[model samples]
Target: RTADLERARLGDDGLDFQDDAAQARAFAQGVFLLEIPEWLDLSAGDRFARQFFQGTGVEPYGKYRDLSSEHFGDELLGYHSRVDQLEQFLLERRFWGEVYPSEIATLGEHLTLLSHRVLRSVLASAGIPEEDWHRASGGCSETNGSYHLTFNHYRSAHQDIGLSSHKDDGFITVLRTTAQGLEVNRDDVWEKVPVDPACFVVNFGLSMEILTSACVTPLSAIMHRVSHQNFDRSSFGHFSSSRCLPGADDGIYRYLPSAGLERVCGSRELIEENDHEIYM
Candidate 1:
C-alpha cells in the first residue's frame, strides 16, 4: 500500500528544494539519503554515525564480482574497495576492539553527536518521536556489522547491483543515490524513485506501519531493487533504533532470544532425531 505522504512530490507542491534545512527533512522523509550538513562540525562520532547509518555502497561484500565485472570490468575493483572502506571504518568504531583513547574518545564523541543529530533529523522529518525511532530495529546488512551507500545506473541495465525484491524493516528508512537505481512495487508495477541531487530518498519501514495503527498508510518496505549501475553509486543508508537484545547489552549475544528458544520447546523428538546441525 502506498502512502500519499511519500508519493507527494516537492515540485507538485511547489516546494523549493534549495532551502538547506527544508531539503534535509524533505529528503529524509521522501528519499532515504539526508545530505550531510556542510557546517555541522562533524567530529569522529559524526563520521561514524554517517558511515554507520548511511551505508557505503550498493553491495557490501562485492559478492557479485562476476556480475560487476560484466559491466565495469577493470574498474570494478576500485569501486569495490571504496565500499569496503565504509564497512571497515564502521566495524572499527562499533567493535572498539582495539584503538587509541584519543582516537576512540574522539570517535565516541562523534558517534554520540551524530546519533543525536540523525535521530532528531529522522524523527522530525517523519513527524515521529525519538522513542519510536529507537523501537525500529536494524543493523548493518553484513554480518561484520556495517552499512554502505547505494548507487543506481540509468543507461546501463547490467551494471546495477544485483538484489532481489525485499522489504526493509525499521520505523523510517533513509536512502541516497546520485542516480535512479531504486524501484518500488506499486499496484504490481515497479516504479522508479527519481534521484534528485541533494535530495535523500525516504521510505516508511515496518515500525512506522505499526506505530500509526495502520491508519497513516503503510509504505510497506515494498519489494524494490536497483536496475541501473554506475561508477558513483555512492549513497548512504541510516537506520534508527536503540533496542538491544538482552544479552547484547554487553555488546554480544552468546544465546538466542527466549522467543527463539521457545519455538523449539516441543522439538525434543526432532532434536533427538536430528538429521542436520543440532544445538546442545
Candidate 2:
C-alpha cells in the first residue's frame, strides 16, 4: 500500500523530466552525484582546500577521535559551532584569524547554504509540504542550531579498514573528497564510488530515512565505508541536521505520523536523552 502511494506521488512512469523527481529518486536510492561547479563556486572550494592543507601540514595522523571504529586509521579536524561562529572557529583552527583568507570563511558559509538549497528542492520534489519542509530544515540559531565541518585524512593504504561502515545520523551530508576510497554497500556488496573533482556526493542519513519511512518508499540511508588503498586520501564533509526543542516534536520526526507512517514511541525523547548521539 505504501509502495503504491509512493508510486502515485512520483507518477506511474516513475520519471519526471521537467523537474528534479528523477534526481530525488537517485538520492533516495543511496548516493547521487551532483555537479558541484554548476551549483557551487568551485573557486571557493579550491581555496579552502589550499588553506586546509597549508594550515594543517598534511600529517600522517592527527589528534582527532574516530567515533565509529578503532580499526579505522584517519585524522580529523572538526568544528561543532553555530553558523555565525563558524568564521572564528575556522580562523582559530586554521591560522588564528591571520594567514587564512576571508574567502575561506565565505566558502564555509556558501557550502552550508548550498546544502540547504539542494535539500529543500529535493524534499519539495518528494511532495513534502512547504511548511513541513521549512520546519525540517536546520538553522543557525544559538540554542539548537549547529553545523559541522570536518577535515578527514586516511594516510596509510596498508590498514585494513580506513573507516568502518555506518549511517549518518543527520538530515544530509555534503561531502567533497580528494581521492577514491569511499564505497557504499548495495545489495550487500561493496561498490567503489568514483572520485570526480567537479562534483560532490550527496547521501541521505538515518534521520532522513526515519522521516520518509524507508519501508513505505525507498528513501533509505546509505550504508557506506572507506577501505585502505595505496595512497593518501583527504576529504571535507559538511554535516547538518534539524534543530529540535526541549519536550517538543518540532523536528523532522513529528511529520512522520501525519504522513501516514507509523510513529516510533519516544524517538524524540531518546534523541534528547542523548543529544550527543547525533554527531558523527
Candidate 3:
C-alpha cells in the first residue's frame, strides 16, 4: 500500500521538539515533509535550472565540484558544519551569504541552515547528548560535517531510474523537487512521494538507524529512488553526512561512525535485519 509522512514547517514555532521522549517515539516513522522558505518559491529553482540547462549558465563562485555524469547531472556544492557555526554559513569552510555570490549558493545556505537545525533538533529530541549529537550525527571540532547541495537536472522524458533504490549514507537528507518520479519503499510496496514546489521530502538514512537502535527509539530510513519522468526536471537535494569517526590513525572522515557502531544497536540483529549496504 502507498504511504505518506508528517508535514511540518522548519522554525522554532514549527514542530514541538520540546519533549525528548515524545519526539523520539514519533521519530520511528522518520520521514517528513518540511516547508522551507528559501525553496517555498518553487519557480526560483525551475528558473535557475532552466538558465543552467541552456548554453549560458551560472557557475559556482569557488570550491564547488562538478559531479556531472551520464547517470547523475548535479553539482556538488558543500555547505554545512557544526551547529555552533550557524551564523557563518559554512559554504565548504568559507562564508556564503557574506560573499553574496550566486543565487544557488544563497539557496544552499538555506538548505544548510535548515539541515543543521533539523538534525540538531532530531538528535536532541532523541535524548542524545549535545556532544554526542554532533559526533554521532556528523561534524567534528576540527572538521565540519559534510553538507552537499545538489542541483539535479535531467532531460525531458528521461525513462531510466535517475537513482537506484537505496538508503542514504548520511544522517538525514532533505530533497525538494517540483516534478514527480521520487518513490519510497514501505512494506515492500513502492509509493510516490507527494511532489510540491514548496516543500522538502525529508528522510532519514542508515547512520541514524544505527545510532538510535542503541539507546533511543530506533529510527527508520526509507529506501527511495527517482523513477522515470516525462518532463524535463530539476531538483534540489541536501545531504548531511556523518561526521568524522574517531580512533582512526589516518586523518580521514568516514561516512559511517565506527565507534558508535560498536555499542550501536546493541547487536548485529538490527544491523543485519535493517540493512542497506549502500547501493549507491
Candidate 4:
C-alpha cells in the first residue's frame, strides 16, 4: 500500500542539518516551512523536522526498483489517498473556491500555512525589515495570482535534467526531496547538492529577482535532475505563487501582483498601468 510505503519511508526519524547558514537559509526559505514553536527547543524541533514525512524519505522506493503489477496499483492507490486528504482539507476550509477546477487537489492547506510561517520566520531572522516583507511579493498575491503546487514523479531523466536548469516563475519556492537527484550551477558548473537526511534545499523564484532590482543577488534557480539510478522516489515542491489578475470577470488575464502591488511596483501609478504576462 502507498500509505504503508509512505509510513515505511518516514519511519519516525529526526531532522538532520547541512553545515552553513546559506544552506540553512536556503533550506528554510526554499524547502519546507519552519515551525517557530519547534525552534524554541532545538533538539526536539530537529527531531520533529527529521521525522516529518514531507521533508524525509518515508518509503524507500527508488526509480529503478522493480515493482510488480500489484505494487504499481498500490502506488496509485496511495497517491489518490494522499490527494483525498488535500481535498478534505479544502472542502472544510473553503479557501480557494475553484482554484483547482478538476477532481485533483493541491498541497494540503496545513502544509501551505506551514510553508508561509517558515518563510516569515526566516525573513525575520535575516533582519528583513517588516516594512519590506510585503515587497517580497514581486506583485503577486493570493487574490490576483495563483501558486502552482506540483510533483515531478513522471519526469524522465533527460527531461528532468533539462527542466532542472530553469528558474522558478513564482514568488518563492520550497522544495524537499529524499535523495541526490538535484544539482546547482556553482562556479559555472553543475554541482550536486548533498541531500542530507531531513534537510530541505530552498531558493527564490524569478519574481524575487525582478522585485529586488538585482540588488539582492537572487539565488539563481539551479538545474536539478532526478537520479538515473532507477529507484522509487517521492518529492514535494510548493510555491508561494499568484494568479493572473484581479478578477475572472474579464476574458483577458494579466499578471499583476494584487496583495503587495504598491510595494513590488514601488508606485501606485506603476501598479495600475503595468500590464505583464502571467506565468504559472
Candidate 5:
C-alpha cells in the first residue's frame, strides 16, 4: 500500500499543475502529500534538517549573520525574497555564506522556483483569469511575490505540542520533515500524516482559501498542527505568502487581507459593490 502511493502522484514529469480534477480531489482531502521532484536537492534539504539540531549547544544556529548582506542563519537558514529579486541573491557570490552555510543558501533558487510554479498552477487551476492571477499573486512580476522558508528544530525544547494548531497565513506551504507527529484536522478527527521519505507535504493556506472562494470551488485551508516527539523532529516550509493589506478578515467567505481583493476583484470597493460579497 505504501509503495503504491509512493509511485502514484509525482512521477517523472513532476507535479501536474494543470490537473484541475486532481487538484480538486487533493483539495477535498484537507491536506495531501506529494513526492518531491527529482530536481530538488534532497540531500541539501535533509542534511540541513539533521544538522539543524546537531551540536544544539555549541554551534547553536549560525553564529555569524550579517543583515547588510541579507544573510542570516538561526534555526531558519534563509528569508523570503520576491520571485523577481531571487536573481542576485542566488547568483551573486557575496550572499553565499563564507562561513559554510551552504545548504539553504544554495537551494534558495530551487525552492523559490518551485513556489513560483506552484503559485501559478494553483491559481490557474482555480479558473482565475490570467490577469487576476497576475494581480492576486502580486508578481506585483511575482518579483513582488514570496516564501518564508524556515528550517525547524523540534525537540530542541521541552514541550508537549511541537507546534500549535493554526492555518498558515500564506497561499500555500510546501514542506518535508525528518520524523513523524505532523497531523491534519480532517473532518473533525486528527489523523497523523504518513511518513514518506520521498514525499513533501503540501497544504493550502488561508490566502488560497479566500482567494478562490468566489471563482470555482475554493479549496479549504488546511487546519494543521505538529506534535512533539522524544527524538528531534526537524523540518522546513516554503510559504507562498501574501503581504497583508490591512483589510478585513471580516467578510462573508472570510476576512481576507485587502491585497488579494485588490488584485483579484479590484479591492474592498469590489467587495462593497457586491452586497453579496462575491470576490471574483
Candidate 6:
C-alpha cells in the first residue's frame, strides 16, 4: 500500500472520484490533517527538538531570541539554497546540518520532496492542468523557494501575546507542533486544533488562492494565531512558495482574471499592508 501510494499520480481517471474536491474544501475551511508515517516518526522529530533546545540554551518555558520581526520568542532556520543567501550557516550550524546527524538533514530533504509530490496530487485532483501546475506550483524546484524551520517557546499561563492573527503570504505551509496552542479563526470564533503526533497540518495561503484565481471555492488563506496557553509549545513549519521566482512579478498575477477573479493586489502589497498592521 505504501509503495502504491508513493507512486500515485493525480488526475488519473481512476482516482478522480475519490473525494478530492471534498478534501480541497476541507483544507479551504482552515486546516487539514495529513498522515505520513515516515514524516511523523516522533523519534526523529524529538531528536531535532532536543537539538533546538540545546543549541539555543533555552529552557522549556524560557524565551529565546526572536529572529524575525514577524513573531516573538522563537528561533528560525532559513535554509533555501537559492532564495536565501545564508548558505554558510546551514553548513556550520550545529542544530542544522553541521553537528546533527546527517539523517536529520536527510529527513528534511525527504519532507520537502514529499510536500511537493503531495501538493501536485492535490492540485491535479482539484482540476489544475499539468501545465498550470508546473507554472504555478513550481514543482519540486528549490529555485526561489522559501524553506525554513521555526522553533517557538512560550511560558505557561503568560498573559503576553505570542502570534498575532494573520494570513500567511506563501502558497502553502506544512506545520508540525509539539504541543497544543495553535488556533484557527473560523467564522470569527477561535477554535483550537488538537495536536496529533501522527499527523501534520497543512494550510493554504493567500498566494495559492490567488494563483488558482479563486476557481477553487473557499480557497482562501487560513487565518490562524497562537494564543497564550497553559503549556510551552514548539512547532516546525515548512513553507513553500514561488513568490520569489525569477519571473514572479510578471507571471504570478497574470492568471487571476481567467478564473473569474480580479487581481487588485499583489503579494508585495498585501505583505506591506500586513507589516503596517503588525507594527501598529
Q: Rate the local accuracy (lDDT) of all candidates.
A: 0.35, 0.51, 0.54, 0.36, 0.52, 0.50
Over 1-280, each residue of candidate 3 has an lDDT whose tens digit, in order, gives: 3456566666664455335454544476667777767634455444544444343235432222222222221112232111111101112323334433466556666666677777776766666645555455546211366555544555544445555577765677888778777888855788888876667788887777666665535677777876654665566566666442222111212123334323343112322233334222
Per-residue lDDT for 64-159 in model 1, tens only? 222232342222111232211121122223323332235434534343344344434433444443333332222221122222222222222233
TM-score of 1: 0.42
Can you write out model 6's per-residue Cα lDDT over 1-280, one digit (the tens) per residue?
Answer: 0000111122333212236555545545646666655534545545454334333556431122322322321122322111111111121122336433566566666566656655665566456555655556533233334444443444444555556676766566777775767788755677787776666777767666666654545366778777665555556666665443223532233244345233445444544565456434
In every candidate, how many clashes are there? 29, 0, 2, 21, 4, 0
Which segments of candidate 1 are over 4 A away from where they belong?
Answer: 1-36, 40-93, 96-161, 213-219, 228-232, 242-246, 249-280
Per-residue error for 42 in candidate 1, Å, reads: 10
Poorest 10 consecutive residues by lDDT, candidate 1: 253-262
Q: Taking the tens digit of each residue's C-alpha lDDT, what string does model 4 give over 91-208?
A: 1112323432222233334335544554454344434455645445422322223343444442232222213244555445656555556655533555556654454455555554
How high a TM-score does candidate 4 get?
0.47
TM-score of each model, in listed order: 0.42, 0.63, 0.67, 0.47, 0.67, 0.66
- Cand. 4 Cα-lDDT: 0.36
Which residue segments of model 5 deviate by more than 4 Å? Answer: 1-14, 17-21, 53-102, 140-143, 243-280
Ten consecutive residues with minimal summed lDDT in candidate 5? 82-91
Best by lDDT: 3
Query: Per-prediction RMSD in angstroms?
Result: 12.7, 9.5, 8.9, 13.0, 9.7, 8.4
Candidate 6 clashing pairs?
Answer: none
Residues 162-181, candidate 2: write the lDDT tens digits: 66576765666778875778
- Sorted by lDDT, highest first, which candidate order results? 3, 5, 2, 6, 4, 1
Higher-TM-score candidate of 4 and 5: 5
Of 3 and 6, the candidate ahead on TM-score is 3
